[PDB]
Amino acid sequence: NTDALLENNRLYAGGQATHRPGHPGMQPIQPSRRVAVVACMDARLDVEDLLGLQTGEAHIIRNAGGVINEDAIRCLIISHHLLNTHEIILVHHTRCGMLAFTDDLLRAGLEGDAAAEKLIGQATGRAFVSAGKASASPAAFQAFRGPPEPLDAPRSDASTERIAADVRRGLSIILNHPWLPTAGPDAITVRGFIYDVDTGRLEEVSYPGPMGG
Amino acid sequence: NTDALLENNRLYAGGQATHRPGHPGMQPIQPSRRVAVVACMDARLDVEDLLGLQTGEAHIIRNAGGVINEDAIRCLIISHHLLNTHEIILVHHTRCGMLAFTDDLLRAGLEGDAAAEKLIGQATGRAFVSAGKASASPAAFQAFRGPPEPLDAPRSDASTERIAADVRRGLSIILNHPWLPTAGPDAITVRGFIYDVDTGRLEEVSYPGPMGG
Amino acid sequence: NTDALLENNRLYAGGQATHRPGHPGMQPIQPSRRVAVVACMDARLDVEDLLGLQTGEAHIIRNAGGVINEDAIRCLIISHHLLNTHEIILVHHTRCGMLAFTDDLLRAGLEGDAAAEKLIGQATGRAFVSAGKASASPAAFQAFRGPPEPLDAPRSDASTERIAADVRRGLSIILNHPWLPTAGPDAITVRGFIYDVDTGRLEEVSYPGPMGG
Amino acid sequence: NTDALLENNRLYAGGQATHRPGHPGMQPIQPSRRVAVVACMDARLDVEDLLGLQTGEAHIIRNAGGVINEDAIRCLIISHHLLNTHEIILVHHTRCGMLAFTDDLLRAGLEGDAAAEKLIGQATGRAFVSAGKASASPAAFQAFRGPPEPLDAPRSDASTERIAADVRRGLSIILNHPWLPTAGPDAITVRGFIYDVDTGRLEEVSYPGPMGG
Ligand code: NA
Ligand code: NA
Ligand SMILES: [Zn+2]
Ligand SMILES: [Zn+2]
Ligand SMILES: [Zn+2]
Ligand SMILES: [Zn+2]
């Protein structure tokens, strides 16, 4: 499945769509390609479109960054163990917001630190307003490791490697989690990619490799 | 935005698509409709298609059930506070897998309880295989409250109310979380729906109302 | 260390204390017995007293039930990897509150379900008052598997086995977590017990064995 | 209760113990002083001893740092709503390990980054060994905000303020959590302190005040 979807993505990047946007009618719950995709929530990604999936074929799991966190694992456990998927595709992407802030800055700005509140407005170009109270949850915002770049900055090699390292960490989480079988007769397989939002083209991340530093 | 998307969904249910499935070219990170959607990962939902969103217009957050958990809140905090969205749409759906199991059954089957392992195979129609070890994470699978129905069962009033109660709980979480402003000049608004996978049509959930029992 | 502490606990159960309750003066951060204990927060447990530990000798991690959850693992990772402990002792106990409710009842009563609110008052003997709103966090209360017994009920074999199964699940979590070494030169060892609050005596839980059903 | 415990702590710091270290015999589950204490797991704290609590009087919740995270809130919800406590005491402490590392360094060293692995050995004085795989959980180690000081360093004003800010964040979490009542007839009250491990004496943290930056 994954190589056919990469060919659909080549077409997509070149200006030819493959996803059919109408309602498919009645379908069974099990994704028919036995695939789960974990991608960023970024509005510039339409995961079915950029892979040429059709409605009904894959679970589509999306969160800020496409990070493999506890919820992503919850989703993948359900997807495989209950709903029979056995392939996972990770789609991080270029110009991701998770490159542009740190957990501590956003936490301090929500808590009410006046400096952090102002700095978040300067980083985002919007009128960020502190909540003025602390919260235990979310315990982590899961910004990519490293110091921030400008929000929505053009590509750079440094940026690409930060995104790739986060993909590799997610591959390692999946390939080492006690409740996801990634070897043996019940095994799931996984591959990870970066979607370039401006070209439309996926590039694959190497694995094993560095996982964020 | 939300009422125009409901009209696109009326068209979609009736067999007329609105989403354009090609790559839109270069776009800014801020979703242009200032909307975030939280939906289930179920393969039968293509969120952009069923709402007639275009690529670039909304954050698309998807997890098993479309539940508002810690990760969903992480996503919504980033979406609003960093990326300027101010409207949220919840899309649960009919025939959801989260109606068809309990946390304890899946946990016990992954841990290695032989009875639970067999019962999960009987509930799913697949060869579920225990991992044979415990895990602290995920701490909760977030199955909808109540005893299970058959996987992918036809609609029923009881089912609909179980799904609706989970939507109302998610609306209440958003409307009471310390770090999401839902009143005042920085406020976010929210509405919740159930997508019927067989008709293609959304129906709105009342709020306030019961939140699961 | 653990067998000497069991002898101190034999003395404790028989009416002879071993812990010295005065301030020990200046001490280094590394626990001098290289032990971490995870126990319930129940007021009837004084962990240093019931094991005859002295101040300075062990990390003392305590939560509702003594459950091995994400925070317990966070604590144990720090305890071993940063602070050089290499032995873990689990102390669950009899008459634990985690035998006396379910996650769903407490969640529904906090959300505002009128039935659940009344039932929690009847189970607890106090005037439980709903918060009247939902929360994403805590995602799980981690009540022991199975239907509730009366709060603070006398011992029973069924109760003991429910507590033991939760201990075994915690041993399995520790012995299978990616970030706790429990084999090789950096290994940690672990044993699990039930403290009888009325006799003062520990009893050891078998492992491997059933982990909750 | 809290002021009487501070007088017991004055005695404790001066060399006079108050906690009785023998088994108290049969007791009810509800803590008799209606108090919950959240403290660090640091071996140099014996919470009952340093407050002069007796066995049976208070819930004792302990984790790395005494941080108010999701598990601490789970514990406090159970403590109050089920078990009738209505006062909370926070006890952070001097020379805490949570001042001496960052989340990212420990995460990268567990994942296998060779630089981080070596740097953690240099910070801890022990042979830290990487696990060589990533994990989604624990999602956060909850080190105190700011750059690390040496492990187990002597007191400093900067250190004290870092610890105090973490106490204030925990007070704010408790005083703003949807499921802890801290006003009205079911209200809980809370105060926060720093325990000096070398003198034995508590000092109280001001609130409201800065919550970490
Ligand atoms: Na789509
Ligand atoms: Na003690
Ligand atoms: Zn992104
Ligand atoms: Zn679903
Ligand atoms: Zn207990
Ligand atoms: Zn500490």
Q: Measure CB to CB from residue D97 to each of C16, C29, C151 and give the nearest one.
A: C29
- Alpha carbon separation from A52 to A47, B21, B39 (Å, rounded): 8, 9, 20
Indicate left, alpha or beta for A148 from its phi (over 0: left) and psi (-120 to 50: alpha): beta
Reduce the DSSP state of residue B63 to 3 states and report it. Answer: strand
Q: Minimal CA–CA distance to C143: which of C76, C69, C74, C36?
A: C69
Token pair in block for residue B39: 């939906």
- Cβ of D15 within 8 Å of Cβ of C22? The answer is yes
Is the CB of C176 less than 8 angstroms away from the CB of A178? yes
Cross-strand bridge partners of residue B203: B194
Q: Given in angstroms, what resolution was this structure solved at?
A: 1.2
Q: In b/e form, how buried is each residue of A120-152, taking b as 16+ CB within 10 angstroms?
A: beebbebebbbbebbbbbbbbbbbbbbeebebb
Measured between CA atoms, how close is D93 to chain A, in angstroms? Answer: 20
Rounded Cα gap, residues C80 and D128, in angstroms: 9
Residue C124, phi-psi category: left (phi > 0), alpha (psi -120 to 50), beta (remainder):
alpha
Given a contact cutoff of 8 angstroms between Cβ atoms, the answer to whether B94 and B155 are in contact is yes
Residue B89, SS3 per DSSP = strand
Q: Please state, in angstroms and rounded to a whole number, the distance separating the CA atoms of residues C125 and B62.
A: 41
Q: In chain C, what residues touch A177 (CB-CB under 8 Å)?
A: 178
Instruction: Quote the tokens at residue A198.
Output: 């401006």
Q: Which residues 16-75 on chain C approach chain D with CB closer than 8 angstroms? A: 16-32, 36, 41-50, 55-64, 69-75
Contacts of D134 in chain A (CB under 8 A): 169-170, 172-173, 176, 211
| A40 annotated as a binding-site residue | yes
**How was this entry determined?**
X-ray
Whole-Å CA distances, C85 to C92, D123, D199: 20, 16, 25
Q: Which amino acid is at C72?
A: A
What token pair was written down for C145? 């598997």
Test the D interface: residue of B137, B169, B171 with most D CBs within 10 Å? B137
Question: Which of B44, B95, B130 has the highest number of chain A CBs within 10 A, making it the mutation to test binding with A?
Answer: B44
Cα D64 to middle of ligand 6, angstroms: 6
Q: How many CA atoms lie within 13 A of B137 on its CB side?
A: 24
Distance of CA A45 to the CA centre of its chain: 10
CA of D54 to the centre of ligand 2 (A): 9
Q: Which ligand is nearest to the CA of D17?
A: 2
B160 class by beta-carbon count within 10 Å (0-12 exposed, 13-18 middle, 19+ buried): middle
Q: Is B132 left (phi over 0), alpha (psi -120 to 50) or beta?
A: left
Q: Rg of chain A over CA atoms, in angstroms?
A: 18
- DSSP state, residue A81: I
* Sign of the dihedral through C-alpha C4, C6, C7, C8: positive
d(CA A73, CA B133): 16
- Backbone phi and psi for residue B193, each to the nearest 5 degrees, phi listed first: -140, 160
Cα gap C52→D22, rounded to integer Å = 10
d(CA A91, CA A12): 15
A44-75 residues labelled b (16+ CB within 10 A) or e (exposed): bbbbbbbbbbbbbbbbbbbbbbbbbbbbbbbb
Secondary structure class of B129 (helix, strand, coil): coil
Quick one: tokens of A191? 């591959």
Across the interface, of A28, A181, A185, the residue whose CB is closest to B131 is: A181
What do you get for the CA distance between the two ends of chain C, in Å? 32
Contact (Cβ atoms closer than 8 angstroms) between residue B88 and residue B38: yes
Tokens for B183? Answer: 């009143």
- The Cα B186–Cα B174 span in angstroms is 14
Torsion of CA B191, B194, B196, B197, to 10 degrees: 90
Number of CB pairs, chain A paired with chain B, less than 8 A apart: 258
Rounded CA-CA distance A113/A117 in Å is 6
- A-chain CB neighbours of C136 within 8 Å are 137
A95 C-alpha vs ligand 3 centroid, how far in Å?
A: 7
State how far the Cα of C175 lies from the Cα of D198, in Å rounded to an integer: 35
* D177:B176 CB<8 A: no
Name the CA dihedral angle for D63, D68, D72, D74, rounded to a multiple of 10 degrees.
Answer: -160
CA angle (A171 as vertex; B140, A190 as ends), nearest 5: 95
Question: Could you tell me whether strands D35-40 and D87-93 are parallel, antiparallel, or unpaired per DSSP bridges?
Answer: parallel
Least CB–CB distance from A134: residue in D136, D142, D176 = D176
* Alpha carbons C88 and C2: distance in angstroms, whole number: 9
Under 8 Å between Cβ of D126 and C84: yes
- Token pair listed for B209: 């109302």
Q: What DSSP designation does C164 have? A: H
**Domain residue spans of chain B:** 1-213
Token couple for D78: 């159970």
Q: Within the 179-208 window of chain D, which residues sit less than 8 Å (CB to CB) from chain C?
A: 179, 181, 185-186, 197-198, 200
| Amino acid identity at A116 | A
> Which burial class, exposed, middle or buried, applies to A154 when counting CB atoms under 10 A from its CB (0-12, 13-18, 19+)?
exposed
Give chains near D: 3+ CB pairs under 8 A: A, B, C
SS3 B108: helix
Characterise C169 by phi-psi region: left (phi > 0), alpha (psi -120 to 50), beta (else).
alpha
Q: Give the containing element (helix H, strand E) for D59.
A: strand D58-63
Cβ neighbours of residue A194 under 8 Å, at least 6 residues apart?
A91, A92, A93, A94, A160, A163, A164, A167, A202, A203, A205
Cα torsion angle, D145, D146, D152, D155, sign: negative
Which among D134, D137, D176 is the nearest to A211, CB-wise? D134
Q: In what order do the strands lie in the sheet with A202-204?
A: A202-204, A189-195, A87-93, A35-40, A58-63, B58-63, B35-40, B87-93, B189-195, B202-204
Q: Tell how far CA C187 is from the center of its chain.
A: 22
Residue D19, CA atoms < 13 Å, CB-side half-sphere? 31
- Between CA C132 and CA C139 the distance in angstroms is 17
Residue list for the binding site of B for Zn(2+) = 40, 93, 96
| Chain A adjacent subunits, 3+ CB pairs under 8 A | B, C, D
Beta carbons of A134 and D104 less than 8 Å apart: no
- Cα gap D81→A55, rounded to integer Å: 46
Question: What's the CA gap between B37 and B190, in Å, rounded?
Answer: 10
CB-based contact B46 A19, cutoff 8 Å: yes
Cβ-based contacts of C185 with chain D (< 8 Å):
129
Q: Which of C26, C61, C71 to mutate to test the interface with D (most CBs of D within 10 A)?
A: C71
Contact C132/A at CB under 8 A: no
Nearest ligand (C-alpha, residue C100): 5
The shortest CB-CB distance from A133 to any of D73, D107, D176 is to: D176
> Is D12 within 8 Å of D200 (Cβ atoms)?
yes
Beta carbons of D49 and C23 less than 8 Å apart: yes
- Residue D39's SS3 state is strand
Tell me how close the Cα of A142 comes to any Cα of chain D, in angstroms: 8
The listed CATH number (3.40.50.2300, 3.40.1050.10, 3.30.1330.200, 3.30.460.20) that belongs to domain C1-213: 3.40.1050.10
How do beta strands A189-195 and A202-204 pair?
A: antiparallel
Neighbours of D140 (CB within 10 A): 20
Q: Is the Cβ of D103 closer than 8 Å to some Cβ of chain C?
A: no
